[PDB]
Curated annotation (Swiss-Prot), chain A:
Listed name of the protein: Large ribosomal subunit protein bL9
Organism: Escherichia coli (strain K12)
Protein family according to the UniProt entry: Belongs to the bacterial ribosomal protein bL9 family.
Lineage of source species: Bacteria, Pseudomonadati, Pseudomonadota, Gammaproteobacteria, Enterobacterales
Cited function: One of the primary rRNA binding proteins, it binds very close to the 3' end of the 23S rRNA.
Subunit structure: Part of the 50S ribosomal subunit. In stalled/collided disomes (pairs of ribosomes where the leading ribosome is stalled and a second ribosome has collided with it) bL9 in the collided ribosome contacts bS6 and uL2, while it contacts only helices of the 16S rRNA in the stalled ribosome; the inter-ribosome bridge thus formed is different from that formed between normally translating ribosomes.
Part of the intact protein present: 1 to 56 of 149
Disulfide-bond pairs as recorded: none
Segment forming the signal sequence: none
From Swiss-Prot, chain B:
PANTHER family: 39S RIBOSOMAL PROTEIN L28, MITOCHONDRIAL, LARGE RIBOSOMAL SUBUNIT PROTEIN BL28M
Native source species: Escherichia coli (strain K12)
GO biological process, one term: cytoplasmic translation
Alphabetic keyword roster: Ribonucleoprotein, Ribosomal protein, RNA-binding, rRNA-binding
Protein name, per record: Large ribosomal subunit protein bL28
Ribonucleoprotein found in the keyword field: yes
GO cellular component, one term: cytoplasm
Length: 56, 77
RNA sequence: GCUUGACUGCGAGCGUGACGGCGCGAGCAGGUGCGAAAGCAGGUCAUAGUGAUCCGGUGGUUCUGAAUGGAAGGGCCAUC
RNA sequence: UGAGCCUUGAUGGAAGUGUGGACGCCAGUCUGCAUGGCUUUAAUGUUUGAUGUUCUAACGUUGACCCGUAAUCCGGGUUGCGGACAGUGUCUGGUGGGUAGUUUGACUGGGGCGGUCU
RNA sequence: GUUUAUUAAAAACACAGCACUGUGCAAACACGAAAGUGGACGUAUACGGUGUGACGCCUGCCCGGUGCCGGAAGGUUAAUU
RNA sequence: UUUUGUAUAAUGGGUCAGCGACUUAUAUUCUGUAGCAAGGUUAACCGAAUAGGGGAGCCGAAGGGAAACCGAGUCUUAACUGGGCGUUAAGUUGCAGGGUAUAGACCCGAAACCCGGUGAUCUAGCCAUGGGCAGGUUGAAGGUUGGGUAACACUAACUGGAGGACCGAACCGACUAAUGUUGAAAAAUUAGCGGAUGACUUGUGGCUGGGGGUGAAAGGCCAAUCAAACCGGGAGAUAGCU
RNA sequence: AGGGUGACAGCCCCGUACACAAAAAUGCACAUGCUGUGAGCUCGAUGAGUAGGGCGGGACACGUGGUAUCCUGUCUGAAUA
RNA sequence: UAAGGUGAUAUGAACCGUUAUAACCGGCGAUUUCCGAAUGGGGAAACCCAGUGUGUUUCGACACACUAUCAUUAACUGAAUCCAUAGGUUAAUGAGGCGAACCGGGGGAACUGAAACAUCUAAGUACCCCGAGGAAAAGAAAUCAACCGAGAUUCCCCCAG
């Protein structure tokens, strides 16, 4: 399970960085609780197009 | 009905097989669990009866998409 | 005393078994020991001292080897 | 807390009035504390496994409550108690006459016992 | 009291009594691939299992074997890696 | 019929009639016979349908060697004076028959094993709800009261009315004998006999179903059967036996 | 062809060969209407918890074998002309 | 179509009919009790008991029709929880059961053979279960071949015991 983050979130968080997180933590807390999202690739651009249409 | 709501997995039959190679009818059955999935698209908890694997399928494809089927296929949820 | 004939390939022609098989055999080829030589030696005076087939192991051998070259596996000789 | 990497103090702006730790060639000198015109060493940040607490958010509830619902089922919801335990799938070692399928030779002055079986 | 309905009614079974043993309750145990249920609307003065078999006087020694109970060293030891 | 042997006092058959057991298919070989002959012959299918077409193919004219391969030879071995198997006999396709192979394979016969149904109207146990026990005894606790004690104890009458208590009918059982035993009866009759307010007895209905039930436990009972029920099915199980 | 008729029938009867038939309801064919329905070209796109793998089984004539291929209960998990 | 007719055991009775409404055959329609899927509820099948809307110069009561379940859809309603969802009522479609074999799938024996027996066999047979058609199923290559080339599935004969 990978998923990219929304909010801060401790020991990993970063408003949209690319973290690899244990299966459960995510499908059980990180989401269905807004704080991250399946790195569905459709997303790794969806949320990289920011790291371009922004930080440059 | 030990049956995975997402993947179709039901129990299957096979043999056991001693060293003596003795056939004895058995059953393999799905690692089922029935989980409380958060939808939000419905602001609710749909709880499916799932196989780890089904769960992986949900974890991939995505819940709203899985729930898409079933409904697409008549199933309850 | 000197030795490795307790040799390898074969074998006219006999025995004895329902059969699987066992047994005796001079002689031919290669190569060897003993003996000056003629010559003797294919274990032990003889007759007991043993276990088929399968499967598998070990060595040797291109005989085979599923498109081709190889390989795996199979065969063949030895052996467990 | 076992082990790797990054590093800032060890092997590979002077002299004097003053300090903890020590394989210190057996009797050193240091490694630091104050001042005064790629390989043998200590803690951080870590990465990586083990052990331990506690948390809650999977999961359990054969506590209480709300509603569907004039309902000792069920479902949803709230709350409390537990809690990543328990349990269940797959694999795996043990136990397992509870259940199962079977085996348990022939000869023989009947059979068995004894003996015998090339 | 019970029993072999149809060759056995007994000295067999059962019994109150006794002992051992298990069970903290979603009990053990039992029917059931499960859900559900008996136990029990009971809760260790209860529930199950096993033996003994009113009552009196009593019930000695043995723990090697087999069974069972406990054992946070070591040896040996599965999947996995 | 079986047997070394059977008048045999060993088997079978009361008798007559009808029926009743070596078959069919496909393979494979041999014999007979027919055709063609170093060749014989087609299968499916086509079809102008018992013709004709179709020669895919099969068998045979060449073996030896594990094989590569060689080839009237070849293999064995370095090679055999040699050895083994071969070269010197005509096949093939129908048709009838003799054997075999697979099939129930000559006919009939098990005790059983497996699957799926039907059965607690008999019986076992339980649940619910209802019914029944003539007559006659014994006379527990407790109570009253007198006697009695310092008070209790204790004691006598009475009163009371327990009990898997007694005797004994109905009711429930079934210890002995006799009869019966092609019965009156597939378990009884008759004389005796145990229980008879209880762990009693009994009506109606309900629940438990086969490796299952139920069992105060005999392997007892589960519809005249039970060390695994009845029915249908696997099924023509298998039978080296008769 | 066959059947029947007082015994065995081409010519007695019913048939057979042969040639004929439907107001109706239907079957199949075509031709047409209706509602649909999409046709042709150019530029694209080209099936992930999937293939593959560990384990356990199962299926392939193939009984784990040296064992390809296929399905998958369980754990995992690619490339992208 | 017709000069004969009202099926049969099975006569008789009383009748019908002869040129087109006797009968007879066939097409299409009417009617079609109760039980039975059985469907208003129940139930020991062929019986019991309703509710709702209707209807009677005699508008008590007794006739007629609707009212099962499930699925899809819609309309109206509508909780814990305010929106929503759940739920509820109604309406329209549909299904339901029966029955040869053949067919596809879920599950799946034993005797038996191996002259015992466990791997193996019998066999994916019998049997049970679900589903469907007139056929089913399968089907247009991540197939085979083998350096030439074939060109989906199905079926038959060889290949070959």
């Amino acid at each position: 399970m990978q998923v990219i983050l929304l909010d801060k979130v401790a020991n990993l968080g970063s408003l949209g960085d690319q973290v690899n997180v244990k299966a459960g933590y995510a499908r059980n807390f990180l989401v269905p609780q807004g704080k991250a999202v399946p790195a569905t690739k459709k997303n790794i651009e969806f949320f990289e197009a920011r790291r371009a249409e922004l930080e440059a | 009905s030990r049956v995975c709501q997402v993947t179709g997995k039901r129990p299957v039959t096979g043999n056991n097989r001693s060293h003596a190679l003795n056939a004895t009818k058995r059953r393999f059955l799905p690692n089922l669990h029935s989980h409380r999935f958060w939808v939000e698209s419905e602001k609710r908890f749909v709880t499916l009866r799932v196989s780890a694997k089904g769960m992986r399928v949900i974890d991939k494809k995505g819940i709203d998409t899985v729930l898409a089927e079933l409904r697409a296929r008549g199933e309850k949820y």
